[PDB]
Amino acid sequence: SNQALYEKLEQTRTILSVKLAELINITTIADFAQENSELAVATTSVMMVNNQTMQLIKNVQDLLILTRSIKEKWLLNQIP
Amino acid sequence: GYIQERLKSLNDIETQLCSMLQEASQVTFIFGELKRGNESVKPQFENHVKQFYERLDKSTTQLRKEIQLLDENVGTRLLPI
């Protein structure tokens, strides 16, 4: 059951590093009228970065859930 | 006590995780600035990205140690199951 803690940790670190690396790859370059308007490239980049952040938040949350579960094991299973 | 030390280490990790979230917000807000043509915050962008990584590495490493310590304390401070 502690093995499951290690495995959850590995998976969450894996996802965070992928999501950060994806975020790093979104062009930071500063911002045919129809095409420009339909594709909305600059807007799309902002939405992409925010989507990465939403996932960085979610996965940090998972690190907190793990930390809490470790706390509770100490609080609950200590020998009196 | 020993258990007090573990909880304080775990509370420390909770602080690191909150710091990581702070970095992510800054990265996000700064990207919006860069996209608008405010290049002045590019160094800060790169710094906050780097810090998020450093914090990810440190917090997950400390967490791995905490899990190891749980495992070593089965039968000694912690009841088996």
Q: What is the CATH class of chain A?
A: Special
Structural class of chain B: mainly alpha
Major sheet attributes of chain B: none
Q: In total, how many domains does the architecture of chain B comprise?
A: 1
Radius of gyration of chain B: 18 Å
Number of domains of chain A: 1
Order of helices and strands of chain B: HH
Q: Kindly estimate the percentage of residues of chain A that lie in beta strands according to DSSP.
A: under 5%
Largest interface, and how many residues on either side?
Answer: A-B, 37 and 38 residues
What is the count of helical runs of chain A? Answer: 3
N- to C-terminal separation of chain B?
A: 23 Å
Keywords (chain A): Acetylation, Activator, Nucleus, Transcription, Transcription regulation
Family (chain A): Belongs to the Mediator complex subunit 22 family.
Subcellular location (chain A): Nucleus
GO molecular function (chain A): transcription coregulator activity
Give a written overview of the molecule:
The complex is a heterodimer of chains A (80) and B (81). In chain A, 82% of the residues lie in helices and 0% in strands. Chain A has 80 residues and is an all-alpha fold. Chain A has three helices and no strands. Chain A starts with a helix and ends with a helix. Chain A has a single domain (1-80), classed as Helix non-globular (Methane Monooxygenase Hydroxylase, Chain G, domain 1). Chain A is rod-shaped and about 75 Å long. Chain A has helices spanning 3-24, 33-39, 41-77. Chain B is an all-alpha fold and 81 residues long. Chain B has a single domain (1-81), classed as Helix Hairpins, CATH 1.10.287.3490. Chain B has helices at 2-35, 42-72. Chain B starts with a helix and ends in a 9-residue tail after the last helix. At the A-B interface, helix 1 and helix 3 of A face helix 1 and helix 2 of B. It is classed as transcription.
